[PDB]
Amino acid sequence: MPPHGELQYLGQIQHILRCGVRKDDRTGTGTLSVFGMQARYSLRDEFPLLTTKRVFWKGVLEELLWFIKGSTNAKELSSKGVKIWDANGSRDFLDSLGFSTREEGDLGPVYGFQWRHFGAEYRDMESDYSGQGVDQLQRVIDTIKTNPDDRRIIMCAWNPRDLPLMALPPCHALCQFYVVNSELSCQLYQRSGDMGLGVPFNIASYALLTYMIAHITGLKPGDFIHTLGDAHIYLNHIEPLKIQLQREPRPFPKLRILRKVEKIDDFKAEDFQIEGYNPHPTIKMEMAV
Amino acid sequence: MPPHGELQYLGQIQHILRCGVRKDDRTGTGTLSVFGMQARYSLRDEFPLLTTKRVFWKGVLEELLWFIKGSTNAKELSSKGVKIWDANGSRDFLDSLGFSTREEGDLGPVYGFQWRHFGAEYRDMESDYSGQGVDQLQRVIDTIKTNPDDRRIIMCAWNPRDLPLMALPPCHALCQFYVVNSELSCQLYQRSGDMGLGVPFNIASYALLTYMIAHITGLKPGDFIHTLGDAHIYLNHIEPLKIQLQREPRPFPKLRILRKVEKIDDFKAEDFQIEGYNPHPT
Ligand SMILES: Cc1cc(O)nc2sc(C(=O)c3ccccc3)c(N)c12
Ligand SMILES: O=c1ccn([C@H]2C[C@H](O)[C@@H](COP(=O)(O)O)O2)c(=O)[nH]1
Ligand SMILES: O=c1ccn([C@H]2C[C@H](O)[C@@H](COP(=O)(O)O)O2)c(=O)[nH]1
Numbered sequence: 001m002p003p004h005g006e007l008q009y010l011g012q013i014q015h016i017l018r019c020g021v022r023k024d025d026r027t028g029t030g031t032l033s034v035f036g037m038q039a040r041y042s043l044r045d046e047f048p049l050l051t052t053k054r055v056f057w058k059g060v061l062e063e064l065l066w067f068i069k070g071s072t073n074a075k076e077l078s079s080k081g082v083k084i085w086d087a088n089g090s091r092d093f094l095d096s097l098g099f100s101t102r103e104e105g106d107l108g109p110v111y112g113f114q115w116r117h118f119g120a121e122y123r124d125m126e127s128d129y130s131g132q133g134v135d136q137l138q139r140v141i142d143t144i145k146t147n148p149d150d151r152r153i154i155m156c157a158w159n160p161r162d163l164p165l166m167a168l169p170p171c172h173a174l175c176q177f178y179v180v181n182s183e184l185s186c187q188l189y190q191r192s193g194d195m196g197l198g199v200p201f202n203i204a205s206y207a208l209l210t211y212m213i214a215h216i217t218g219l220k221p222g223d224f225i226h227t228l229g230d231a232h233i234y235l236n237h238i239e240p241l242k243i244q245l246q247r248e249p250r251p252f253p254k255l256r257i258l259r260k261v262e263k264i265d266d267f268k269a270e271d272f273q274i275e276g277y278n279p280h281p282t283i284k285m286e287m288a289v
Numbered sequence: 290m291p292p293h294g295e296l297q298y299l300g301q302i303q304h305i306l307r308c309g310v311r312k313d314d315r316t317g318t319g320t321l322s323v324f325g326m327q328a329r330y331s332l333r334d335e336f337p338l339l340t341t342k343r344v345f346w347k348g349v350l351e352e353l354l355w356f357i358k359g360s361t362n363a364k365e366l367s368s369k370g371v372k373i374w375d376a377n378g379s380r381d382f383l384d385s386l387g388f389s390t391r392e393e394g395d396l397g398p399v400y401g402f403q404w405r406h407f408g409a410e411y412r413d414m415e416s417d418y419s420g421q422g423v424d425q426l427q428r429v430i431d432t433i434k435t436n437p438d439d440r441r442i443i444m445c446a447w448n449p450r451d452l453p454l455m456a457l458p459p460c461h462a463l464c465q466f467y468v469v470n471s472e473l474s475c476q477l478y479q480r481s482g483d484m485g486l487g488v489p490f491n492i493a494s495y496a497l498l499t500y501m502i503a504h505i506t507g508l509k510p511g512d513f514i515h516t517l518g519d520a521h522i523y524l525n526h527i528e529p530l531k532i533q534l535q536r537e538p539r540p541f542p543k544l545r546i547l548r549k550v551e552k553i554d555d556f557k558a559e560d561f562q563i564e565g566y567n568p569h570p571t
Contacts, residue, residue, distance in 0.1 A: 080365075
C-alpha cells in the first residue's frame with residue numbers, strides 16, 4: 001500500500017534534527033533550523049490530523065471559523081476555550097510592542113482582517129468594515145465555481161502596509177488553490193513554522209479550510225501541499241520530539257460534514273464530525289513567547 | 290394630554306419616590322420600592338431610548354444578539370466590549386454558588402439557553418444543543434407568521450427546574466407578543482427592576498426585540514408594555530434620580546434597519562442605525 005501520510009512530517013522533523021543548524025533568536029531559546037521544505041498530504045479520504053501526538057482539534061476548528069468571520073479579537077476566540085492567541089493579545093505583550101492604547105485581545109489586522117477586508121484602513125478590532133477592502137475569500141470561492149482552471153486563485157495574508165499594526169505578522173503569507181478533474185487542491189506557503197508546536201496545528205487548519213471550500217463548490221478534496229521557509233525546532237523541543245519520533249503513526253481520521261452548507265459564512269462548529277481519531281497522548285511543548 | 294412617553298418612566302420614578310416603602314435586599318443597600326407597576330411605550334416611528342440619562346445602546350444591541358445566538362458565555366459578550374454580565378461570570382462570584390467545577394464566564398442556563406433550548410439538559414456553555422429543547426424564539430416567529438390571533442405567544446425564561454444552575458435568576462420571566470392590525474406589540478414581565486440603571490436598559494432591549502421580530506414578520510411595531518414586580522430605587526440613587534427627574538425629556542430617536550433580513554439569526558449589529566439620539570449627560 002502507499003506509505004502513511006504522517007511520515008511526511010516525521011521525516012521533516014528528522015531532517016532538521018540531523019541536518020539542522022543552530023540559530024539564536026528573540027525568545028532566548030535557540031533553534032535548529034532549515035530553510036525550504038515541502039510536503040504533500042492527500043485529503044482523500046483521510047484527513048491529515050496528526051496521530052503521533054494529539055492535536056488541538058477543538059482549537060483548530062474554532063479558530064478557522066473565527067477567521068471566516070473576519071475576527072481579529074483574541075478574546076472572542078479565547079472565550080470559546082481556545083487560548084492559542086492570548087499570549088499575543090495580552091495587555092503585557094501588546095504594551096511591549098508600543099500598543100499602549102489598544103484593547104486587550106486586539107491582534108491587529110491579521111488573518112481575519114486580510115482574508116475579507118484586505119486594503120481596508122484598520123481602526124480597531126470592533127469597528128465596522130463591511131464593504132471595505134477586498135474579500136479574498138469569496139473572490140476565491142466564486143472563482144473555483146466559475147473558472148476552475150484559474151492559476152491565480154490566491155489568498156494573501158501578507159500586507160506590508162498593515163505590518164506595524166499586527167501583534168504578530170502572518171505565518172501564512174499566502175495560500176493558493178487548484179482544481180483539476182473537479183478535485184480541489186491547496187498549497188500553503190508558510191514563512192516560519194514551529195515544527196514542534198505549531199506545524200501540526202497548521203496542517204489541520206488548511207486541510208480543514210480545503211474541505212470547507214470543496215463542500216461549498218461541489219468539489220472533492222485532493223492534496224494539501226505544505227511549503228515552508230524557516231522550518232525550525234526550538235532547542236527545548238528536541239527531547240519531546242525525539243520521544244514522538246519513536247511512535248508509529250496510526251491511520252488518519254476521516255472528516256464528516258454533517259449538513260449541506262450553502263455559503264462559507266454559515267458554517268458552524270457542530271457541522272463537522274471527526275471519525276476514528278486514535279492519537280497517541282499529547283506532549284507538552286513550551287510556546288516560546 | 291397624558292404621557293407620552295419617556296414621561297411614563299419618570300412618572301414611575303416619581304411614584305416610587307412619593308409612594309415608595311423602604312425595604313432591604315440582598316446587597317444590604319436598601320431601597321424605596323413599589324410592587325406592581327406598568328407603563329406603555331409606543332414604538333410607532335419612534336424608538337423608546339430614554340433621553341434624560343444616557344442608555345448604553347451598544348450593550349442593548351450586542352446583548353440582544355447574544356441572547357438570540359443562544360449564548361450564556363459571559364466572556365463571549367465581554368469580548369464584544371460590553372461587560373455587563375462580567376460581574377457574575379467571575380470565579381470569585383461563580384463558586385460563591387458552589388460552581389467550583391465550572392469554567393469562568395459560564396453563567397449557566399440563563400436567558401439565551403431558555404429562549405432557544407428550553408427544557409434541554411444544560412451541561413456547559415461551549416456545548417452542542419442542536420435540536421435539543423424547545424426553541425421558544427423561533428416558535429414565536431412561526432406563530433405570528435401563521436396565527437396572528439393566537440394568545441399563547443409566550444417566550445418564558447423562568448425555568449424553575451434550572452434555577453439551581455443559573456448564575457442569576459432571570460429578571461425577565463416572560464414576554465408575550467400580540468398582533469393586531471398588522472402591528473406587533475410586546476409585553477414584558479420583569480420580576481425585579483431598578484429604575485436607576487437596569488430598567489431603562491431593559492426597555493431598550495425589548496423594544497429592540499419587537500423591532501427585529503416585526504421586521505422578520507412584515508409587521509409594523511406597536512406598543513411595548515413594561516410590567517414590573519418589585520420596582521425599586523436604590524437609596525444612593527435617590528439624589529441623582531431627583532436631578533435627572535427635572536430634566537426636560539427630548540424626543541425619542543428613530544431606529545432604522547439597513548437591510549432586509551430573512552431569519553432572526555442573520556441580524557448583525559451593523560444592520561442597525563440609530564438616528565437623532567440626543568440624551569443629556571449623567
Ligand atoms: C513560538 C510562538 C511565539 C509567539 O510569539 N507566538 C506564537 S503562536 C504559535 C502557534 O503555534 C499557534 C498556531 C496556530 C494558532 C495560534 C498559535 C507559536 N508557536 C508562537
Ligand atoms: O500559526 C502560526 C503562528 C506562529 N508560528 C510560529 C513560528 C515561530 O516559532 C513563531 C513566529 O515567530 P516569528 O516568525 O515572528 O519569528 O511562531 C507557527 O508556527 N504557526
Ligand atoms: O436584566 C436585568 C437583570 C437584573 N436586574 C436587577 C434588579 C435587581 O436589582 C437585581 C436582581 O436581584 P434579584 O432579583 O435576584 O434580587 O438586578 C435588572 O433590573 N435587569
